[PDB]
Amino acid sequence: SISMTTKLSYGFGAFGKDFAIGIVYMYLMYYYTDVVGLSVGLVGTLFLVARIWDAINCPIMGWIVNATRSRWGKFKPWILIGTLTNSLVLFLLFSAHLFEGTAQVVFVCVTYILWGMTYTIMDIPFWSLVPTITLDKREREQLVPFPRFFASLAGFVTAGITLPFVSYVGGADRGFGFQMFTLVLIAFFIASTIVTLRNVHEVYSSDNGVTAGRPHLTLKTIVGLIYKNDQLSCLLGMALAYNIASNIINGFAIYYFTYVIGDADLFPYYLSYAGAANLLTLIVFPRLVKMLSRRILWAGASVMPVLSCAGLFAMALADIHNAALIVAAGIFLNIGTALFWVLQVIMVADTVDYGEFKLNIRCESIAYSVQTMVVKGGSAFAAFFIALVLGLIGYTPNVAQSAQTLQGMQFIMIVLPVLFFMMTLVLYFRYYRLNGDMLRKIQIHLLDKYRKT
Ligand SMILES: O=[N+]([O-])c1ccc(O[C@H]2O[C@H](CO)[C@H](O)[C@H](O)[C@H]2O)cc1
């Protein structure tokens, strides 16, 4: 039994954790372009460089978390530090409207990077608590839905309430409203950190005496344990492919809603229905993973978005008008993404257990470093592939193109995510082994091996 209290406290921790970044991810473009007034090229270059640099930084944070011998634990201290420092840096991030000229181009450039690193400090260790809470298949299956559901809910309520709050509190001074809302986020986020730190207790931590973890390891060694843990490498590839495809699809949606108005008030309906789908499929995930195989659910996680892509491909070939097609594609995609995230967290935990099984080392921090690194690098790589595709199609001037050229660009933008999803499902079914009796073997081997000295 995982104490219902620990489940709920981890859920609220995840809520506060993703409620502090959803605003950034979603409206930092709007803030920096519509409020601060910075060139879109500057913002894009900064975002891409920062994602690459944060992805490079992630394994560094994993090494840091692994080598930290502390009282609270090897995770909670960095969780607290990252939470507080990232709260401060988020407030500073959205306080950019105050400065002007180079002074703010530096400010914006200095805060943003600091916002990305700081979050890493708390992001890697937080999820590293999943493997230490339990080692059982079904207990993980019923543990992770709580945090994933709460994170998704944070994202959607952010989308719903952030603009109303800014308009009501600040009005003309939209930047003041943004930073006041940041304060709301900080309150929820710090309270969530306190809750998770107090009520979540580590059982199978690498800082316990019976575990096989070695604190005094090098950065070369740790990053090599990604390659040695073939299952973690397979997870890296799969998650990178899934993230690249999901980022391409989300960019398509951003263009087809922001630039192409489509129909008025289609985006609110789409967002509401898609959030319902996401949160519901997260709520029923234990029942589904009992009824259907975990493998079936991963296959579905990749396939359902592919069905969305195919449907809206058909819409591209025909008239791009059906709102039902759009909202149904969103529903399918959100079901898939929820399944993916739940299964991915469980799979990172399974990979740390398999690392102890094979290499005789327990490193949670590195597996979740791979998770976050892949989140950043998927966006970066999706940008790279999109730029390659657009340059190949002849959009590299970005001045004016044939309508047929634009439609073919849409077609390719649709097919590419499908290729990446096929990559992830193919790689999962060809190389991944931690799903069945192997999971039980690793669990029993670890429990039996957990005998002092
Ligand atoms: O498609 N998006 O815009 C998008 C949504 C959520 C997100 O956050 C996830 O990746 C983070 C990595 O820093 C944290 O692991 C966090 O816990 C995850 O929920 C990242 C991007």
XYZ file of C-alpha atoms and ligand atoms in Angstrom:
474
model
C 0.000 0.000 0.000
C 1.293 3.392 -1.073
C -0.281 5.686 1.511
C -3.100 7.639 -0.118
C -1.604 10.670 1.633
C 1.739 10.264 -0.151
C -0.083 9.824 -3.468
C -2.054 13.038 -2.953
C 0.969 14.983 -1.694
C 3.031 13.949 -4.722
C 0.074 14.930 -6.899
C -0.100 18.405 -5.375
C 3.674 18.723 -5.645
C 3.426 17.980 -9.362
C 0.520 20.423 -9.668
C 2.546 23.264 -8.184
C 5.614 22.172 -10.150
C 3.929 22.320 -13.564
C 1.784 25.331 -12.577
C 4.998 27.380 -12.352
C 6.258 26.578 -15.878
C 3.041 26.265 -17.861
C 2.747 30.050 -17.823
C 6.295 30.394 -19.171
C 5.984 27.724 -21.868
C 2.604 29.057 -22.987
C 2.772 32.872 -22.811
C 6.444 33.872 -22.580
C 6.396 34.454 -26.336
C 3.364 36.713 -25.928
C 5.013 38.534 -23.026
C 8.359 39.123 -24.735
C 6.833 40.144 -28.089
C 3.530 41.850 -27.176
C 4.672 43.520 -23.917
C 8.462 43.908 -23.908
C 8.637 44.403 -27.679
C 11.579 42.220 -28.705
C 12.296 40.885 -32.179
C 10.848 37.454 -32.898
C 14.186 36.323 -34.322
C 15.961 37.267 -31.101
C 13.363 35.419 -29.017
C 13.540 32.319 -31.206
C 17.332 32.164 -31.227
C 17.359 32.612 -27.448
C 14.764 29.883 -26.903
C 16.590 27.399 -29.142
C 20.030 28.096 -27.662
C 18.581 27.893 -24.148
C 16.881 24.559 -24.819
C 20.118 23.107 -26.211
C 22.093 24.427 -23.243
C 19.553 23.131 -20.714
C 19.608 19.710 -22.368
C 23.397 19.719 -22.037
C 23.036 20.894 -18.423
C 20.608 18.110 -17.482
C 23.161 15.267 -17.094
C 25.231 17.730 -15.058
C 22.327 18.149 -12.644
C 21.956 14.369 -12.552
C 25.595 14.018 -11.528
C 25.131 16.758 -8.918
C 22.077 15.050 -7.422
C 23.831 11.675 -7.379
C 26.924 12.946 -5.539
C 25.053 14.973 -2.889
C 25.281 13.426 0.590
C 22.801 15.332 2.760
C 20.524 14.938 5.769
C 17.126 15.473 4.132
C 18.254 13.131 1.362
C 19.980 13.265 -2.015
C 16.832 14.705 -3.662
C 14.879 16.881 -1.224
C 17.634 19.512 -0.689
C 17.991 20.181 -4.415
C 14.202 20.095 -4.774
C 13.860 22.875 -2.193
C 16.776 24.909 -3.566
C 15.577 24.675 -7.157
C 11.994 25.479 -6.203
C 12.889 28.656 -4.311
C 15.530 29.898 -6.749
C 13.273 29.200 -9.737
C 10.402 31.070 -8.085
C 12.662 34.102 -7.666
C 14.024 33.784 -11.201
C 10.500 33.452 -12.629
C 9.455 36.699 -10.984
C 12.592 38.349 -12.377
C 11.900 36.757 -15.777
C 8.489 38.403 -16.020
C 9.794 41.675 -14.546
C 11.562 42.388 -17.863
C 9.133 45.137 -18.929
C 10.825 47.536 -16.498
C 14.195 47.899 -18.232
C 14.915 49.164 -21.747
C 17.522 48.942 -24.469
C 20.525 46.666 -24.123
C 19.939 46.653 -20.359
C 16.875 44.453 -20.833
C 18.207 42.462 -23.796
C 20.783 41.350 -21.235
C 18.172 41.016 -18.473
C 15.818 38.965 -20.649
C 18.793 36.922 -21.847
C 20.160 36.418 -18.319
C 16.895 35.644 -16.523
C 15.573 33.188 -19.113
C 18.632 30.924 -19.029
C 18.645 31.153 -15.233
C 14.981 30.131 -15.283
C 15.798 27.031 -17.323
C 18.713 25.820 -15.212
C 16.980 26.552 -11.896
C 13.946 24.466 -12.834
C 16.260 21.587 -13.761
C 17.667 21.700 -10.224
C 14.195 20.817 -8.940
C 12.873 18.895 -11.955
C 15.366 16.005 -12.048
C 15.237 15.142 -8.314
C 11.456 15.504 -7.968
C 10.596 12.742 -10.435
C 13.532 10.753 -9.046
C 11.233 10.184 -6.051
C 8.975 7.890 -8.104
C 11.377 4.888 -8.083
C 12.103 5.289 -4.362
C 8.403 5.315 -3.422
C 7.808 1.771 -4.692
C 9.207 -1.025 -6.850
C 5.965 -2.817 -7.786
C 4.404 -2.732 -11.243
C 0.806 -2.057 -10.213
C 1.788 0.322 -7.409
C 3.722 2.463 -9.901
C 0.799 2.191 -12.326
C -1.512 3.640 -9.664
C 1.078 6.091 -8.294
C 2.076 8.064 -11.388
C -1.452 8.952 -12.615
C -1.837 11.306 -9.647
C 1.123 13.590 -10.507
C 0.476 13.431 -14.252
C -3.203 14.331 -13.780
C -2.338 17.217 -11.471
C 0.308 18.535 -13.882
C -2.084 18.441 -16.839
C -4.753 20.175 -14.755
C -2.259 22.902 -13.851
C -1.513 23.408 -17.535
C -5.152 23.689 -18.556
C -6.234 26.008 -15.747
C -3.193 28.117 -16.627
C -4.421 28.355 -20.215
C -7.872 29.278 -18.947
C -7.144 31.811 -16.222
C -3.759 33.436 -16.920
C -5.021 35.984 -19.462
C -8.166 36.932 -17.469
C -6.029 37.451 -14.355
C -3.506 39.644 -16.178
C -6.258 41.763 -17.725
C -8.163 42.148 -14.445
C -5.217 42.915 -12.162
C -2.961 44.930 -14.461
C -5.014 46.063 -17.434
C -2.871 48.375 -19.549
C 0.304 47.413 -17.644
C 0.122 43.807 -18.798
C 3.618 43.159 -17.435
C 2.572 44.105 -13.911
C -0.350 41.700 -14.221
C 1.973 38.957 -15.448
C 4.294 39.311 -12.455
C 1.376 39.460 -9.997
C 0.103 36.202 -11.475
C 3.651 34.910 -11.087
C 3.206 35.572 -7.372
C 0.090 33.377 -7.379
C 2.146 30.675 -9.090
C 4.947 31.049 -6.534
C 2.540 30.624 -3.630
C 1.034 27.437 -5.055
C 4.484 26.160 -6.050
C 6.232 26.676 -2.708
C 3.261 25.289 -0.781
C 3.331 22.244 -3.068
C 7.064 21.804 -2.470
C 6.572 21.929 1.303
C 3.742 19.397 1.026
C 5.674 16.915 -1.113
C 8.846 17.229 0.970
C 7.025 16.634 4.258
C 4.546 13.924 3.277
C 6.502 11.951 0.633
C 8.870 9.472 2.278
C 11.689 7.682 0.474
C 11.716 3.882 0.766
C 14.116 2.536 -1.889
C 16.395 5.561 -2.167
C 19.976 5.383 -3.394
C 20.940 7.121 -0.127
C 19.720 4.180 1.972
C 22.270 1.686 3.229
C 20.986 -1.417 1.451
C 20.855 0.125 -2.034
C 23.595 -0.443 -4.609
C 24.175 3.215 -5.482
C 27.674 4.685 -5.397
C 27.675 8.428 -4.567
C 31.315 9.016 -5.576
C 30.975 8.567 -9.332
C 32.304 10.696 -12.176
C 30.384 12.579 -14.853
C 31.945 10.353 -17.517
C 30.805 7.266 -15.604
C 27.266 8.520 -15.003
C 26.629 9.644 -18.584
C 28.080 6.327 -19.747
C 25.525 4.489 -17.627
C 22.967 5.790 -20.145
C 24.645 3.761 -22.890
C 25.304 0.769 -20.631
C 21.642 0.729 -19.538
C 20.386 -0.254 -22.980
C 16.806 0.111 -21.748
C 17.423 3.724 -20.737
C 18.960 4.337 -24.174
C 15.887 2.830 -25.828
C 13.754 5.096 -23.644
C 15.854 8.101 -24.678
C 15.296 7.339 -28.352
C 11.586 6.616 -27.946
C 10.892 9.725 -25.875
C 12.934 11.910 -28.225
C 10.944 10.678 -31.226
C 7.623 11.123 -29.424
C 8.577 14.625 -28.273
C 9.759 15.701 -31.729
C 6.476 14.530 -33.257
C 4.367 16.114 -30.509
C 6.234 19.412 -30.841
C 5.739 19.433 -34.614
C 2.009 18.816 -34.167
C 1.707 21.488 -31.470
C 3.489 23.967 -33.724
C 1.056 23.113 -36.504
C -1.787 23.845 -34.080
C -0.180 27.120 -32.973
C 0.058 28.248 -36.594
C -3.447 27.053 -37.518
C -5.019 28.819 -34.507
C -2.900 31.942 -33.964
C -2.162 32.872 -37.584
C -5.063 31.128 -39.340
C -8.054 32.146 -37.225
C -9.992 29.123 -38.454
C -13.359 29.650 -36.783
C -14.027 32.087 -33.958
C -13.909 30.499 -30.492
C -12.815 27.113 -31.828
C -9.718 27.059 -29.603
C -11.614 27.306 -26.281
C -13.823 24.353 -27.232
C -10.837 22.391 -28.554
C -8.821 23.056 -25.392
C -11.693 22.107 -23.083
C -12.504 18.856 -24.889
C -8.824 17.921 -25.184
C -8.210 18.611 -21.500
C -11.224 16.503 -20.595
C -9.769 13.687 -22.700
C -6.300 14.011 -21.146
C -7.505 14.173 -17.545
C -10.046 11.377 -18.010
C -7.581 8.991 -19.645
C -5.215 9.751 -16.764
C -7.960 9.085 -14.205
C -8.841 5.707 -15.722
C -5.266 4.673 -16.512
C -5.052 2.034 -13.724
C -8.275 0.406 -14.909
C -7.051 0.544 -18.516
C -3.596 -0.889 -17.799
C -5.309 -3.725 -15.933
C -7.821 -4.353 -18.735
C -5.279 -3.853 -21.535
C -1.565 -4.582 -21.637
C 0.972 -1.874 -20.884
C 2.376 -2.614 -24.346
C -1.071 -2.064 -25.854
C -1.265 1.296 -24.094
C 2.146 2.403 -25.396
C 1.194 1.326 -28.912
C -1.991 3.348 -28.506
C -0.060 6.327 -27.149
C 1.827 6.452 -30.438
C -1.058 5.358 -32.693
C -3.856 7.696 -31.566
C -1.841 10.848 -32.418
C -1.050 9.180 -35.749
C -4.787 8.810 -36.349
C -5.220 12.508 -35.560
C -2.476 13.343 -38.063
C -4.133 11.188 -40.727
C -7.556 12.741 -40.187
C -6.300 16.298 -40.415
C -4.129 15.279 -43.381
C -7.379 14.306 -45.083
C -8.752 17.692 -44.025
C -5.722 19.367 -45.616
C -6.359 17.541 -48.895
C -10.013 18.613 -48.696
C -11.474 21.794 -47.197
C -9.971 22.793 -43.846
C -13.292 23.617 -42.184
C -14.652 20.787 -40.033
C -14.442 21.798 -36.382
C -15.393 18.251 -35.384
C -12.286 16.909 -37.119
C -10.103 19.442 -35.294
C -11.497 18.766 -31.826
C -11.454 14.995 -32.410
C -7.819 15.140 -33.517
C -7.085 17.106 -30.354
C -8.911 14.532 -28.229
C -6.981 11.654 -29.805
C -3.670 13.489 -29.429
C -4.319 14.305 -25.772
C -5.278 10.720 -24.937
C -2.019 9.649 -26.554
C 0.107 12.214 -24.722
C -1.387 11.340 -21.329
C -0.748 7.639 -21.927
C 2.787 8.472 -23.050
C 3.660 10.552 -19.990
C 2.272 8.095 -17.435
C 3.960 5.133 -19.119
C 7.174 7.140 -19.515
C 7.478 7.966 -15.819
C 6.822 4.335 -14.885
C 9.361 3.292 -17.520
C 12.091 5.595 -16.206
C 11.579 4.005 -12.785
C 11.745 0.537 -14.342
C 14.980 1.555 -16.077
C 16.615 2.591 -12.808
C 15.646 -0.797 -11.361
C 17.084 -2.515 -14.447
C 20.241 -0.462 -13.978
C 20.628 -1.911 -10.504
C 19.849 -5.321 -12.032
C 22.544 -5.186 -14.732
C 25.247 -2.712 -13.658
C 24.821 -3.048 -9.862
C 24.273 0.724 -9.593
C 21.070 2.582 -8.677
C 20.905 6.030 -10.319
C 17.436 7.584 -10.407
C 18.824 11.041 -11.131
C 20.343 10.012 -14.457
C 17.191 8.378 -15.812
C 15.119 11.450 -15.001
C 17.930 13.616 -16.356
C 17.389 11.718 -19.601
C 13.663 12.428 -19.320
C 14.094 16.200 -18.931
C 16.989 16.330 -21.408
C 14.716 14.642 -23.940
C 11.910 17.109 -23.235
C 14.244 20.005 -24.072
C 16.078 18.296 -26.933
C 12.852 17.196 -28.581
C 11.782 20.800 -29.040
C 15.277 21.724 -30.228
C 15.438 18.804 -32.678
C 11.915 19.481 -33.931
C 13.009 23.030 -34.715
C 16.079 21.689 -36.525
C 14.055 19.221 -38.602
C 11.390 21.826 -39.398
C 14.074 24.251 -40.572
C 15.715 21.544 -42.688
C 12.356 20.661 -44.255
C 11.416 24.288 -44.930
C 14.803 25.055 -46.464
C 14.484 21.980 -48.664
C 11.002 23.041 -49.797
C 12.275 26.527 -50.647
C 10.674 28.448 -47.770
C 14.152 29.588 -46.718
C 13.467 33.154 -47.982
C 10.297 33.291 -45.854
C 8.993 36.116 -48.070
C 6.428 34.529 -50.411
C 5.775 31.011 -51.690
C 3.423 29.178 -54.020
C 0.107 28.147 -52.496
C 0.886 24.616 -53.675
C 4.285 24.934 -52.000
C 2.532 25.888 -48.755
C 0.067 22.995 -49.031
C 2.893 20.533 -49.668
C 4.690 22.006 -46.670
C 1.576 21.228 -44.627
C 1.499 17.677 -46.003
C 5.142 17.076 -45.074
C 4.652 18.666 -41.648
C 1.857 16.154 -41.129
C 3.741 13.096 -42.336
C 6.926 13.779 -40.354
C 5.350 13.377 -36.867
C 3.883 10.088 -38.075
C 7.357 8.902 -39.065
C 8.665 9.777 -35.603
C 5.743 8.004 -33.898
C 6.394 4.913 -36.000
C 10.021 5.165 -34.898
C 9.054 5.178 -31.226
C 6.627 2.244 -31.479
C 9.042 0.237 -33.650
C 11.925 0.827 -31.241
C 9.735 -0.004 -28.240
C 8.594 -3.315 -29.716
C 12.025 -4.282 -31.082
C 14.331 -3.349 -28.187
C 12.331 -2.726 -24.985
C 12.050 -5.669 -22.588
C 10.900 -4.191 -19.241
C 7.176 -4.900 -19.474
C 6.383 -8.389 -18.220
C 8.048 -11.251 -16.379
C 11.318 -9.321 -16.708
C 9.898 -6.562 -14.502
C 8.986 -9.141 -11.860
C 12.430 -10.738 -12.087
C 14.094 -7.370 -11.505
C 11.721 -6.531 -8.649
C 12.284 -9.825 -6.828
C 16.036 -9.694 -7.473
C 16.224 -6.204 -5.977
C 14.059 -7.014 -2.952
C 16.014 -10.194 -2.206
C 19.304 -8.374 -2.826
C 18.208 -5.638 -0.380
C 19.765 -7.273 2.677
C 22.220 -5.241 4.730
C 25.918 -5.927 4.124
O 4.319 20.614 -24.891
N 4.669 21.548 -23.943
O 4.544 22.685 -24.176
C 5.200 21.127 -22.624
C 4.322 20.787 -21.596
C 4.813 20.397 -20.359
C 6.177 20.342 -20.139
O 6.674 19.947 -18.867
C 7.113 18.649 -18.870
O 8.564 18.632 -19.079
C 9.297 19.320 -17.959
C 10.740 19.225 -18.202
O 11.365 20.317 -17.656
C 8.942 18.704 -16.602
O 9.428 17.342 -16.543
C 7.477 18.683 -16.388
O 7.193 17.973 -15.138
C 6.754 18.006 -17.520
O 5.351 18.094 -17.311
C 7.061 20.687 -21.170
C 6.574 21.076 -22.402
